[PDB]
Design an enzyme around this catalytic site. Structure first.
Site, short mmCIF file in Angstrom:
data_model
loop_
_atom_site.label_atom_id
_atom_site.label_comp_id
_atom_site.label_asym_id
_atom_site.label_seq_id
_atom_site.Cartn_x
_atom_site.Cartn_y
_atom_site.Cartn_z
N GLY A 1 0.86 4.67 9.37
CA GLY A 1 1.27 4.14 9.04
C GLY A 1 2.67 3.69 8.09
O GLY A 1 1.62 3.11 7.22
N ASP B 1 -15.25 5.52 9.30
CA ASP B 1 -14.44 6.08 8.32
C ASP B 1 -14.33 4.13 7.69
O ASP B 1 -12.98 4.50 7.61
CB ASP B 1 -12.99 6.54 8.92
CG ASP B 1 -12.51 7.36 7.96
OD1 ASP B 1 -13.14 8.13 7.11
OD2 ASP B 1 -11.23 7.44 7.99
N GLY C 1 1.15 -1.09 -0.36
CA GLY C 1 0.37 0.24 0.08
C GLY C 1 0.47 0.94 -0.01
O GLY C 1 1.65 1.13 -0.89
N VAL D 1 3.98 0.29 5.77
CA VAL D 1 3.55 -1.48 6.26
C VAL D 1 4.10 -2.11 4.98
O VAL D 1 4.46 -1.85 4.06
CB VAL D 1 1.61 -2.06 6.12
CG1 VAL D 1 1.55 -3.11 6.21
CG2 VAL D 1 1.27 -0.45 6.57
C1 LIG Z 1 -0.76 -7.66 0.85
C2 LIG Z 1 -1.72 -6.48 0.44
C3 LIG Z 1 -1.07 -5.45 -0.47
C4 LIG Z 1 -2.60 -4.09 -0.23
N1 LIG Z 1 -2.58 -3.42 -2.26
C5 LIG Z 1 -3.09 -1.81 -1.81
O1 LIG Z 1 -2.77 -1.42 -0.43
C6 LIG Z 1 -3.14 -1.55 -3.86
C7 LIG Z 1 -2.03 -2.56 -4.25
C8 LIG Z 1 -2.97 -1.47 -5.55
C9 LIG Z 1 -3.40 -0.84 -6.16
C10 LIG Z 1 -4.53 -0.11 -4.44
N2 LIG Z 1 -5.23 1.02 -4.75
C11 LIG Z 1 -6.04 1.28 -4.31
O2 LIG Z 1 -6.35 1.13 -2.68
C12 LIG Z 1 -6.70 2.54 -5.07
C13 LIG Z 1 -8.76 2.37 -4.64
C14 LIG Z 1 -9.18 3.78 -4.47
N3 LIG Z 1 -10.64 3.70 -4.16
C15 LIG Z 1 -10.79 3.49 -3.24
C16 LIG Z 1 -11.58 4.08 -5.64
C17 LIG Z 1 -3.68 -0.50 -3.60
C18 LIG Z 1 -3.07 -3.94 0.41
C19 LIG Z 1 -2.92 -5.03 2.02
C20 LIG Z 1 -1.94 -5.62 2.20
N4 LIG Z 1 -2.26 -7.11 2.94
C21 LIG Z 1 -2.58 -6.77 4.74
N5 LIG Z 1 -2.14 -7.16 5.12
C22 LIG Z 1 -2.05 -7.47 6.88
C23 LIG Z 1 -2.42 -5.91 7.10
C24 LIG Z 1 -2.50 -4.57 6.25
C25 LIG Z 1 -2.40 -3.28 6.15
C26 LIG Z 1 -2.13 -2.02 5.12
C27 LIG Z 1 -2.62 -0.73 5.46
C28 LIG Z 1 -2.62 -0.88 6.77
N6 LIG Z 1 -2.67 -1.33 7.89
C29 LIG Z 1 -3.06 -2.90 6.94
N7 LIG Z 1 -2.62 -4.64 4.61
#
Ligand SMILES: Cc1cc(NC(=O)c2cccc(NC(=O)CCCN(C)C)c2)ccc1Nc1nccc(-c2cccnc2)n1
Length: 341
Positions: free
Chosen positions: A28, A141, A27, A30
């Site tokens: 504090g 939220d 994607g 992470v």
């Molecule tokens: C491995 C992994 C990958 C991702 N991938 C992305 O974030 C991603 C990838 C490509 C495009 C995008 N687009 C967008 O969001 C745009 C959306 C727009 N619309 C709202 C209109 C996001 C997410 C979380 C995980 N796994 C994981 N596991 C445990 C805890 C946490 C975590 C994460 C964040 C905070 N705390 C804990 N995450």
């Protein structure tokens, strides 16, 4: 000390226990890591100086306490918490280790989801919300960026929401600074469900003013009864807005968005549009509850009557009282929570 090592991730230095190997950004800030002790992939979230101001401190303390005491299939589970610093005096950073999930909901929404996948994801979201509500946690939220999914479409809520910008998913109550109750969270579910169906953000406001305009343009100017629930200056603005009829839910979510090849699919289109019509309601007094949403025939197909209901989180004593603290008091509270003292 020799228990820790440092790796550069983006603009951030991650100083982690040696068990956590091959840190990769997600994607504090992470990272995904391999935990050599669990022999499982994990997520590591770095809180940098969470005590440095009372707003960050309160949110960080609450997140630590809640992630520890909450235990539900649809809320992200705590694996570990640590600080690399050896004392309260030197204490700076908190690392939260949680279950690694495959993607956030934003990624899943871009897939061509069927009724089975959509209803299953929405059931789990509502289950997670119902559990937070049972613990006196109203999120306010919920958005695709704080909900995560595994490739088997198991779903988990990442965090515990607001104290007490992407505003596309915020309820009118939140937008307009109104009173709220539990079903403030139903609005977010409605926004996500509608987006899953239409393949685009329902209410894509560029700012607070535009966010309100996008809602009333689609759904129509709310009833005079609703206008009386606004702060005087907000009431003036909202009443001064041009009048909008809005659109029927059939015109918001046309049949072409759904499969129509069987009675089953025709019924599921009707049920989906019915639930949407009950969640995407500006006036919270006329909006469906989480209990009612879970009992809706679109959603209730995923209810297993044999499944043990998780009891409400036992939040130790009242360490989540809504009391303010000095920065030094917050630092000691967060440090104690990290060290288990
Ligand atoms: C491995 C992994 C990958 C991702 N991938 C992305 O974030 C991603 C990838 C490509 C495009 C995008 N687009 C967008 O969001 C745009 C959306 C727009 N619309 C709202 C209109 C996001 C997410 C979380 C995980 N796994 C994981 N596991 C445990 C805890 C946490 C975590 C994460 C964040 C905070 N705390 C804990 N995450």
């Amino acid at each position: 000390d020799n228990n820790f090592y440092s790796v550069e991730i983006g603009d951030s230095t991650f100083t982690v226990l040696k068990r956590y190997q091959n840190l990769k950004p997600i994607g504090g800030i992470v990272c995904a890591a391999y935990d050599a002790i669990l022999e499982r992939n994990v997520a590591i979230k770095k809180l940098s100086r969470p005590f440095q101001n009372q707003t960050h401190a309160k949110r960080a303390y609450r997140e630590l306490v809640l992630m520890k005491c909450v235990n539900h299939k649809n809320i992200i589970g705590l694996l570990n918490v640590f600080t690399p610093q050896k004392s309260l005096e030197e204490f700076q950073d908190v690392y939260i280790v949680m279950e690694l999930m495959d993607a956030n909901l934003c990624q899943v929404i871009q897939m061509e989801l069927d009724h089975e996948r959509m209803s299953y994801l929405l059931y789990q979201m509502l289950c997670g919300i119902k559990h937070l509500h049972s613990a006196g946690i109203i999120h306010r939220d919920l958005k695709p960026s704080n909900i995560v999914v595994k490739s088997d479409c198991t779903l988990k809520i990442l965090d515990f929401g607001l104290a007490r910008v992407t505003r596309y998913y915020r309820a009118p109550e939140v937008i307009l600074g109104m009173g709220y109750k539990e079903n403030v969270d139903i609005w977010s579910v409605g926004c996500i469900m509608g987006e899953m169906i239409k393949g685009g953000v329902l209410f894509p406001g560029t700012d607070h003013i535009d966010q309100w305009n996008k809602v009333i343009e689609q759904l129509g100017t709310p009833c005079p009864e609703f206008m009386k629930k606004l702060q005087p200056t907000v009431r003036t603005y909202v009443e001064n807005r041009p009048k909008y009829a809005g659109y029927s839910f059939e015109k918001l979510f046309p049949d072409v968005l759904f499969p129509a090849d069987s009675e089953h699919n025709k019924l599921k289109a009707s049920q989906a549009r019915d639930l949407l019509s009950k969640m995407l309601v500006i006036d919270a007094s006329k909006r469906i509850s989480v209990d009612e949403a879970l009992q809706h025939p679109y959603i209730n197909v995923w209810y297993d009557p044999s499944e043990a209901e998780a009891p409400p989180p036992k939040i130790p004593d009242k360490q989540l009282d809504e009391r303010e603290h000095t920065i030094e008091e917050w630092k000691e509270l967060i440090y104690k929570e990290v060290m288990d003292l």
